[PDB]
């Protein structure tokens, strides 16, 4: 229930990386193995030449601390960085429990790689179940998709001359923007918004390319999400493996999710301007 | 459609001795009406020399 | 959208082994090409541009248009199991 | 054209200089112009003479005496221009006059030592600091003094507080407990006062006779009274009744400690605690604490006067004398120099200990000046203070009203120990005693709401963060042109009337008159009222009070205009609003952005960059212009000659714009033709529809510069050498790469083009041999040469304007050590208005552009005329805001009479006067209309007929007066365009003042398909090079595991995150085009076993049986 | 709200495909017409009905008698306060109802007013503070101040007025930014608590269910009367029965869903008198080791049609209770 | 027993959602003072895990 | 090859830590400034946790394909990535027992009930 040895991380989960200068950065995990290293280097000197009671006591709290100190800090204390910087150390309890841990982070998986974001503008001209993608936007988030299209065609030789030739935009081609549309015939694509306070946070729709900067947004689902045109943006996650396409565009795009999970009302309801138009025509 | 200074070379420069920037000029420039008298005619290029 | 969603929904119980089953036709018909398909004589799926529907631009609404026909079966068990999950992944 | 105004309202006094606050406080905190002779003392001079004047009287070598006489400083190193073009700090060297003094004969003065660097003011308020400029905002928190709080339980009674400063010092507190106990804890310990008392030498006698002589509750200290006749002996007793271990024996030490100096506030004479002294109680606290120390006795003027008010309220009624812990009197500001002061006297403090030290150590005397000071302590203190302090944050140069409200703008924050950022919800919200100092709508909306603000425009902070509102004295029945700075303290005992009560001139014209009696709105009688408000514009902001229509908007939308007017982007050709308030020109002349002629002169030279002006005297003074300046947030800074060559000029007027002005007059933004009704669906709920017209003319149009920057530093591999000369391979684009390593100016790049060509080393410690014996058999010596070299990041660029080089042949730069060379490359492009981008009135309607439609097929009026921007009428009923209905109103008369008009806020034009002038411009209009002899449209008689059925307009009448009375309303008659057929009943059209808001890379899709890994977790995130991917967070989990989703989560889990096998595969599949593999463990959860395993526990993963399973392939186990 | 159940008939009568297709006609016709209709907010379509002038007079009037009330000691400071609080509470809706009268009776093509009266935007009160009075207004402390706002953005306020206002425009503003936190807070928790809860599950023997009664037990001290149509279609539709009913000469089989129909029938029948409760089954009688049954649960999603086995209802459960928590 | 919402999520048999959710230290201390065989079953343990969720598909 | 099932949680023995670990540090010496190489047997060193480098060991005799096995002829190294830097593991041999702060520390205080 007590630890006689003492388990070292790897190291490159606390490594020291040179930012600028030949200064190294370096997490304080590899400060506190340092101090508890020192301190029984210097306990393992001290009980082999003599033993000053006192001392030996004095040195043995102070390597207790260490190792106490190396677990977690501030419950004993506050073992800091060097003076000049009193920030305390951050320990193992500190990577995992907290309101940013690693807990809280591999529960999350913060970062992901098909995705983008960008203003959203409203697309009337657009049915329910469509959305406005930038070409742009577009074009990168299919990247893989583009080059294995392309190369079913004669565009270019192989994967590398393909790349280079999409890697600028001043060889960008026609055939190189039918290609895209070749890919999307029938792909869907989920759009997300920050605040996701229920299901319907998240939405797949077919995109459809649109030259611009912005997102089109069809209008009934202003609600659904509860974005409105004021300067919000939102997100753009591009599924990949059949499977999944299969999943969005069954049970996730907006035209199969009309009505609410927290009751039979319909969230695809008409909207304030279109209720307007319609009082408008149909008053006595 | 184009505009060429023999000194500035790019378009947020100033001329020594001129009161308006390259930009003001461009804009200026803008609003000039040219009309051809030769309808087959497609390309002109006026020049413009002025000093004091 | 697709050809007659309402119909699916009727002629399954529950949606999820719509999924499954239309998916499990779409990675069927990639193992094996689009050859394996039982809808080729006349009605294909056509392109605008030109007739890319014929090949491959999108499994999911192959199987879908599949199964609108009758040519369609599924159960939870139907054939040992085994052996085709154990030849699936091999190719 | 014209400038009509509305307001009738006599402003008896102009506004006071709106950046004076830190200008004066910085200029009474540094007394370098005045001799230092002067009586001035308060600030660094009195930080000097309070700690510096280090004494030593038996320490080894005794009689230290180290004094200070003078300092000065008077010569910047650099001109403030090439400090911000080299990265230095507008600073100026710091000299002391100082002497050593010893009991024995010698008098060894030093009238020169240097010690730091302290950095100085520009001219507008703002300071320089690497390069960057950087501005100090004003912090609120407690005044310094004595108050009284109720008890937290007990309701009959309280108790009292004495604050001094610092937070190591002093903090009293006076209780008092029913069993007859007249409790003190100074520190941390209660105590009974008594005893301190009887040590201040004040006997029973006189204790009852002027203490206990009114009050019962002396009952409380008389019935201790057999330790009440103590003189000295109390002295130890208390000093023993501390537990430090220490004899008793040390008469001074700590009884002391609240002496003179050393703990007790030095709070500034008279008001700082003064004021909070005598004016609160007693008569007068002479001198600067409670102490006596010429007799080794003491004396006090504090306690006894604080137990007696204390006493006298928990007793009798003096009055409802308890102190409001959020009132503004008892709330103090501390400026730039009150900062500057207390972080200077910290590291002189330091110092002295420094030199106390080496004193002890030392051994000769003769060592004045460089054995005792270095500079090292205070210097890096002051730097410190100046570059990484909280309060000391980067300037909001957007634009020029940005730059005023951010210098002067309140904190409640600061360093720490006053308030934090987790819980402040009490105080968050307004005071009645913010009325004339705080504008209670400046507020930015976030976390920081409430706690950070900014104070009206009358507001003046006197000499110690005391906000003093102006009021005219009110004498019987006239008000008088005597204008009087109250503070809250002095105002809350008056009555005060309002700047809207009708008046003759100099008396008052109304008999039931509104008043506020103390912060209580009430209704009085003339002869009862004291003093005047001066003018509404004394109870907002800067900021708040330039949106017009004040009167008929909403608290929350006029706070976010507000704040939108901060952050509007400066445009190519900017014009002033249509509607003004009145206060663009202060804000423009005080703001000091544009130039103006200092006296009565004709002008010389005009040129694009430099005004040569010869003045009355002869004396002709040469102005540089910053033609195209970057800002701090990357918008461009102008000056435009506004002069002719010979042209005569006044005192003060007008020489060159500034960034966003158009003649003298705050302009940032457009005036457009809107028309307030819904379109089809492009302005749905919020968004905005535009016209063509105005990008065919370049009308909201913006130029933005990106300053990229790279380095060659000096490594162990050998210095990195910026060389044309690419290593590899590009050679064909290096066509635009002209001299060595910088790109050709005027030449236009894209993403993925070389700006600078820098080369590293091949390998860090053994390059290629490959490539070595390459260069090595074509060229004699070897080439160890890797490219690392600065490319234009994907995405957008320009055109090259700048090019700045600083290498290590420094004329007076600095580089960070082993840098041997940098350089700054500018780029700057024009930016168009586009769909991404968005807009604002100055009402806070925000708004997004959604299409932007051909002129032909936009709403047009009878004349040919297209309306410029649409908009939805759904958003004005929804919030509050109709005071953008009244500027379009004022904007439609304008725009046929041509001119503008100015309104005060608060004393705007009655609806009378904008109908009396739309009928002005019905008539202009109408008349211009029948002068090319033309009656009425069909359509217009047909939308006359329907808006009689609709009730707009009286019936039977002629067209002619039904379209006058129509346009009277506002709305006049508009044509589809699309279809020809006009629309249906009348639109209501008009000009409005919008302006482009700031736009960075927020539109900008930062998507991405591969990028930049980070270490510890291979979770995706790039930034400088590739913009990273998007947080996926738990809530779309818990969204995306709500649907029946369960490959999707799987897939954008392992296989998009984390699992770098998985993701790899995936990508060589999609490559091939085939179908992903299934994914594994991601590398994060890996992580996790490994930190658990770092600890004592150990978790392993078990299969269906007691079947370890190792989640690696094999490289957990050994060997 | 019509076209609310219009849509939800449509979607029950038709299904997916046409309930979309009326859906995208209706918001095309809609912006159509809204375009070539041609509403617009003017300064004096905010209309200022001349009644209420007097009704302030009065109200003046009033005060002053209870200001004279109050002079002559016969009420204490809390008693005025009180008395106050509600003469202003009062009139304010005497002014509303005014206002409404005037608009139906003279310009029912008002945009405001039409605004109102369809679901597009604006509230009562919105309407009241654009052309009446915004009345009273909250303190800081939470209480409400004394002297009421007699202007409204038709006219001008004064600047006292304005400043007043300011205290509830940073109540609000601060309230948004903490409760917001707070009930995120709530929603984590929630989230869970139930995350375990899917429906993976054979109709459990559950010989059990709950009673849901129809009757409020107490509006007034000793009083039944018929709760409202919100609380009984929120607790009944969906629901699974527990046992036979037969009410109003119709056989409800045990396990039938429970539709909108039903409930309305269920409705009518108690408003008739016959049945009060109502034996329905419940997740809280479910005995499923992890999660709940089909039946127990019952029949609401995205559909009507009864829940698919193997969707996390705890989850949806959770986002349910937790997504109104930051509008409140 | 009726305990209060943040109760019931802590005491759960899965160690690793109650690790998750509020207190991983005292979580964690308990679930190592005996062996917690932690069943893959409810949503966020097969989250954390990365591997298919038992509910949906 | 087979799938998880279930995730156990327990205390590590010494013996466990000692099995876990690939050698045991001594040094307080990360990095030199100038060797940019890992210094010692500090908390990076090379051969107690895996090389640093990609693919090749420290000589590179025995390293190819056809031969990678084949234990080096100068060296001892094993083909492989910095992977194991990340997974390989150490061990401190401390003198003198200590206890986890978790087991006295926490609020129900195990080693103290
Ligand atoms: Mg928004
Ligand atoms: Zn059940």
Redesign the pocket.
């Known amino acids: 229930m007590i630890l006689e040895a003492v388990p070292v991380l790897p190291p490159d989960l606390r490594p020291m990386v040179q930012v600028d200068g030949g200064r190294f950065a370096t997490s304080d995990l590899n400060d506190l193995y340092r101090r508890l290293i020192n301190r029984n280097n210097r306990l393992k000197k001290l009980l082999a030449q003599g033993a000053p009671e006192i001392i030996i006591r004095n040195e043995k709290r102070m390597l207790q601390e260490a190792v106490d100190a190396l677990l977690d800090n501030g419950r004993r204390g506050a073992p800091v960085t060097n003076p000049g910087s009193d920030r305390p150390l951050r320990s193992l309890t500190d990577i995992l429990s907290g309101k940013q841990g690693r807990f809280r982070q591999n529960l999350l998986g913060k970062r992901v790689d098909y995705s983008g974001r960008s203003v959203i503008v409203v697309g009337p001209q657009l049915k329910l179940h469509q959305c406005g993608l930038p070409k742009r936007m577009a074009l990168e988030l299919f990247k893989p998709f583009l080059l294995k299209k392309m190369e079913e065609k004669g565009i270019a030789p192989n994967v590398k001359a393909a790349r280079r030739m999409l890697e600028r935009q001043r060889d960008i081609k026609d055939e190189v923007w039918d290609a895209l549309e070749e890919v999307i015939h029938g792909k869907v694509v989920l759009l997300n918004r920050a605040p996701t306070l229920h299901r319907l946070g998240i939405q797949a729709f077919q995109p459809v390319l649109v030259e611009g900067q912005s997102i089109q947004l069809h209008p009934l689902v202003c609600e659904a999400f509860n974005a409105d045109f004021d300067g919000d943006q939102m997100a753009v996650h591009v599924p990949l493996s059949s499977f999944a396409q299969a999943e969005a565009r069954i049970q996730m795009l907006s035209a199969h999710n009309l009505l609410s999970p927290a009751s039979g009302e319909p969230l695809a309801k008409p909207s304030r301007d279109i209720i307007l138009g319609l009082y408008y025509i149909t008053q006595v | 459609t184009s505009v060429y200074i023999e000194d500035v070379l790019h378009e947020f420069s100033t001329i020594p001795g001129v009161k308006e920037d390259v930009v003001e000029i461009i804009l200026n420039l803008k609003e000039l009406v040219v009309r051809f008298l030769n309808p087959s005619l497609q390309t002109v290029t006026l020049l413009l020399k002025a000093e004091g | 959208a697709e050809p007659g969603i309402d119909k699916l929904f009727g002629m399954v119980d529950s949606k999820y082994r719509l999924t499954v089953v239309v998916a499990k036709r779409a990675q069927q018909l990639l193992r094996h090409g689009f050859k394996n398909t039982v809808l080729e004589p006349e009605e294909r799926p056509k392109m605008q541009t030109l007739e890319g529907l014929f090949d491959d631009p999108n499994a999911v609404t192959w199987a879908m248009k599949e199964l609108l026909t009758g040519r369609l079966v599924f159960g939870e068990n139907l054939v040992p199991e085994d052996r085709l999950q154990k030849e699936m992944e091999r190719l | 054209m014209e400038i009509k105004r509305f307001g009738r309202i006599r402003e008896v006094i102009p506004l006071p200089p709106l950046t004076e606050i830190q200008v004066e406080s910085y200029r009474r905190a540094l007394q370098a112009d005045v001799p230092p002779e002067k009586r001035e003392n308060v600030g660094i001079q009195a930080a000097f003479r309070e700690t510096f004047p280090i004494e030593e009287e038996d320490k080894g070598k005794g009689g230290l005496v180290l004094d200070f006489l003078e300092y000065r400083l008077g010569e910047p190193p650099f001109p403030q221009d090439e400090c911000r073009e080299k990265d230095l700090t507008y600073q100026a060297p710091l000299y002391a006059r100082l002497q050593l003094i010893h009991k024995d004969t010698g008098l060894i003065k030093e009238d020169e030592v240097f010690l730091g660097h302290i950095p100085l003011m520009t001219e507008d308020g703002s300071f320089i600091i690497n390069g960057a400029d950087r501005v100090i905002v004003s912090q609120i928190h407690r005044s310094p003094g004595v108050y009284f709080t109720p008890d937290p339980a007990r309701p009959g009674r309280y108790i009292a507080s004495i604050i001094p400063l610092p937070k190591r010092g002093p903090w009293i507190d006076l209780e008092v407990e029913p069993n007859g106990v007249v409790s003190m804890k100074v520190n941390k310990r209660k105590f009974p006062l008594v005893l301190l008392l009887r040590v201040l030498g004040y006997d029973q006698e006189t204790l009852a006779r002027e203490l206990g002589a009114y009050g019962e509750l002396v009952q409380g200290l008389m019935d201790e009274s057999v330790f009440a006749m103590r003189p000295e002996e109390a002295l130890i007793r208390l000093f023993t009744l501390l537990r430090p271990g220490d004899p008793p024996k040390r008469d001074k030490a700590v009884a002391y400690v609240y002496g003179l100096i050393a703990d007790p506030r030095r709070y500034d004479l008279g008001e700082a605690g003064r004021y909070k002294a005598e004016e609160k109680l007693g008569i007068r606290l002479s001198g600067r604490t409670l102490a006596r120390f010429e007799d080794g006795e003491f004396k006090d003027e504090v306690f006894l006067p604080t137990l007696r008010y204390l006493f006298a309220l928990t007793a009798g009624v003096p009055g409802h004398e308890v102190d409001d812990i959020d009132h503004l009197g008892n709330r103090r500001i501390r400026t730039v120099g009150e900062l500057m002061t207390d972080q200077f006297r910290v590291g002189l403090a330091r110092l002295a200990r420094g030199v106390r030290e080496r004193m002890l150590m030392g051994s000769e005397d003769s060592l004045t000046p460089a054995k005792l000071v270095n500079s090292r302590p205070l210097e890096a203190a002051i730097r410190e203070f100046f570059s990484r302090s909280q309060l000391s944050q980067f300037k909001d140069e957007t634009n020029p009203l940005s730059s005023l409200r951010h210098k002067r703008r309140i904190s409640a924050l600061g360093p720490g120990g006053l308030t934090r950022e987790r819980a402040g919800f009490d105080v968050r919200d307004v005071h009645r005693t913010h009325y004339g100092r705080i504008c209670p709508v400046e507020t930015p909306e976030g976390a920081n709401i409430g706690l950070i603000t900014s104070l009206a425009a009358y507001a003046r902070v006197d000499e110690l963060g005391f906000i003093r509102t102006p009021y005219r004295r009110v004498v019987g029945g006239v008000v008088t042109d005597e204008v009087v700075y109250m503070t809250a303290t002095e105002e809350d005992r008056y009555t005060i009337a309002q700047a809207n009560t009708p008046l003759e001139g100099n008396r008052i014209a109304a008999e039931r008159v509104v008043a506020r009696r103390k912060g209580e709105p009430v209704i009085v009688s003339p002869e009862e009222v004291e003093f005047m408000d001066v003018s509404p514009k004394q109870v907002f902001s800067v900021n708040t009070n330039l949106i017009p229509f004040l009167e008929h908007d909403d608290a929350n939308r006029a706070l976010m205009g507000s704040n939108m007017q901060t952050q509007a982007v400066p445009l190519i050709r900017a014009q002033a609003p249509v509607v003004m308030t009145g206060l663009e020109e202060r804000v423009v002349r005080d703001s000091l952005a544009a130039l103006y002629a200092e006296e009565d002169g004709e002008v010389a030279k005009v040129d694009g960059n430099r005004i040569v002006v010869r003045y009355e005297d002869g004396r002709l003074v040469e102005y540089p212009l910053r033609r195209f300046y970057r800002s701090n947030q990357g918008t461009a800074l102008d000056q435009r000659p506004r002069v002719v060559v010979g042209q005569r000029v006044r005192k003060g007027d007008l020489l060159a714009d500034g960034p966003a002005s158009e003649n003298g007059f705050l302009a940032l933004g457009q005036n457009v033709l809107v028309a307030i009704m819904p379109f089809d669906g492009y302005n749905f709920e919020d968004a905005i529809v535009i016209s063509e017209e105005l990008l065919k003319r370049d009308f909201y149009t913006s130029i933005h510069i990106e300053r990229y920057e790279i380095e060659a530093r000096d490594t162990k591999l050998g210095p990195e050498r910026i060389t044309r000369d690419i290593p590899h391979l590009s050679e064909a684009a290096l066509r635009d790469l002209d001299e060595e390593g910088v790109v050709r100016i005027g030449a236009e790049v894209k993403p993925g083009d070389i700006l600078v060509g820098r080369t590293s080393f091949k390998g860090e410690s053994e390059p290629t041999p490959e490539e070595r014996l390459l260069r090595s058999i074509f060229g004699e010596k070897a080439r160890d040469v890797k490219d690392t070299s600065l490319r234009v990041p994907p995405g957008e660029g320009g055109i090259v304007v700048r090019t700045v080089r600083l290498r290590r042949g420094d004329p007076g730069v600095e580089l960070k050590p082993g840098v041997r060379e940098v350089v700054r490359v500018y780029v700057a492009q024009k930016r168009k208005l586009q769909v991404g981008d968005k807009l604002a009135n100055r009402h806070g309607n925000k708004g997004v552009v959604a299409k932007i439609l051909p002129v032909e097929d936009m709403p047009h009026l009878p004349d040919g005329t297209p309306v410029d921007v649409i908009l939805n009428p759904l958003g004005v009923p929804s919030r509050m805001n109709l005071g953008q209905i009244l500027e379009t109103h004022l904007g439609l008369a304008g725009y046929f009479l041509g001119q503008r008009y100015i309104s005060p806020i608060f004393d705007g034009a009655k609806e009378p006067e904008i109908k009396e002038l739309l009928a002005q411009a019905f008539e202009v209009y109408f008349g211009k209309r029948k002068g090319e002899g033309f009656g009425v449209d069909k359509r217009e008689v047909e939308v006359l007929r329907r808006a009689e059925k609709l009730g707009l307009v009286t019936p039977g009448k002629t067209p002619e007066e039904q379209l006058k009375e129509l346009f009277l309303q506002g709305k006049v008659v508009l044509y589809d365009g699309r279809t020809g057929e006009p629309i249906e009943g009348p639109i209501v059209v008009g000009q409005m003042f919008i302006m482009k808001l700031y736009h960075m890379v927020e539109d900008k899709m930062h998507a991405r398909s591969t990028g930049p890994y980070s270490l510890i977790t291979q979770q995706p995130l790039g930034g400088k090079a590739q913009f990273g991917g998007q947080r996926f967070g738990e809530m779309e989990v818990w969204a995306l595991e709500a649907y029946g989703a369960a490959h999707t989560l799987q897939e954008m889990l392992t296989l998009k995150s984390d699992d770098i096998e998985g993701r790899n595969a995936a990508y060589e599949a999609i490559i091939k085009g085939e179908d992903v593999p299934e994914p594994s463990v991601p590398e994060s959860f890996r992580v996790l076993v490994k930190e658990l395993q770092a600890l004592a526990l150990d978790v392993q993963t078990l299969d269906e049986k007691d079947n370890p399973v190792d989640i690696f392939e094999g490289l957990a186990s050994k060997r | 709200n019509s076209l609310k159940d219009l849509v939800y008939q449509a979607f029950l009568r038709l299904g997916m495909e046409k309930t979309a297709r009326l859906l995208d006609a209706l918001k095309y016709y809609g912006f159509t017409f809204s375009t070539t209709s041609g509403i617009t907010i003017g300064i004096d379509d905010a209309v200022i009905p001349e009644e209420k002038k007097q009704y302030l007079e009065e109200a003046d009037r009033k005060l002053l008698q209870i200001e004279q009330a109050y002079e002559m000691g016969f009420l204490t400071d809390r008693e005025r306060y009180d008395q106050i609080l509600q003469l202003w509470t009062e009139t304010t809706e005497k002014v509303t109802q005014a206002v409404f009268k005037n608009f139906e009776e003279n310009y029912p093509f008002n945009p405001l007013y039409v605004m109102a009266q369809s679901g597009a935007r604006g509230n009562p009160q919105q309407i009241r503070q654009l052309c009446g009075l915004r009345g009273l207004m909250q303190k800081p402390s939470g209480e409400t101040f004394e002297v009421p706002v007699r202007s409204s953005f038709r006219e001008g306020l004064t600047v006292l007025e304005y400043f007043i206002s300011s205290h509830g425009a940073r109540k609000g503003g601060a309230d948004t930014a903490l409760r917001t936190a707070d009930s995120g807070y709530l929603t984590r928790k929630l989230v869970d608590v139930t995350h375990e809860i899917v429906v993976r599950?054979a109709?459990?023997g559950?010989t059990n269910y709950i009673s849901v009664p129809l009757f409020q037990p107490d509006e007034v001290t000793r009083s039944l009367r018929l709760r409202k149509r919100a609380d009984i279609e929120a607790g009944l539709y969906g629901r699974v029965l527990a046992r036979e009913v037969e009410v109003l000469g119709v056989r409800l089989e045990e396990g039938r869903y429970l539709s909108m129909d039903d409930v309305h029938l269920l409705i009518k029948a108690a408003e008739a008198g016959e049945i009060q409760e109502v034996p329905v089954?419940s997740?809280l009688?479910?005995?499923?080791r992890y999660g709940?049954?089909?039946?127990?649960?019952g029949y609401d999603l995205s559909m009507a049609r009864p829940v698919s086995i193997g969707e996390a209802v705890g989850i949806v459960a959770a986002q349910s209770i937790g997504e109104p928590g930051t509008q409140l | 027993l009726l305990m209060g919402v943040t109760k019931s999520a802590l005491s759960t048999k899965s160690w690793l959602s109650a690790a998750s959710f509020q207190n991983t230290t005292h979580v964690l201390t308990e679930a190592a003072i005996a062996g917690k065989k932690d069943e893959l079953i409810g949503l966020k343990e097969n989250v954390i895990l990365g591997r298919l969720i038992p509910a949906g598909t | 090859k087979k799938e998880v099932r279930k995730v156990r949680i327990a205390l590590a023995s010494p013996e466990k830590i000692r099995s876990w670990s690939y050698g045991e540090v001594e040094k307080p010496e990360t990095i030199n400034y100038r060797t940019l190489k890992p210094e010692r047997d500090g908390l990076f060193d090379e051969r107690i946790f895996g090389p640093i480098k990609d693919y090749e060991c420290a000589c590179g005799k025995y390293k190819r394909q056809r031969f990678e096995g084949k234990v080096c002829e100068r060296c001892g190294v094993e083909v492989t990535k910095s992977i194991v830097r990340r997974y390989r593991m150490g061990h401190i041999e401390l003198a003198t027992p200590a206890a986890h702060i978790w087991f006295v520390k926490d609020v129900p205080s195990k080693i103290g009930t």
């Open positions: 599950e109709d459990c559950t089954r997740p009688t479910c005995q499923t709940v049954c089909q039946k127990c649960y």
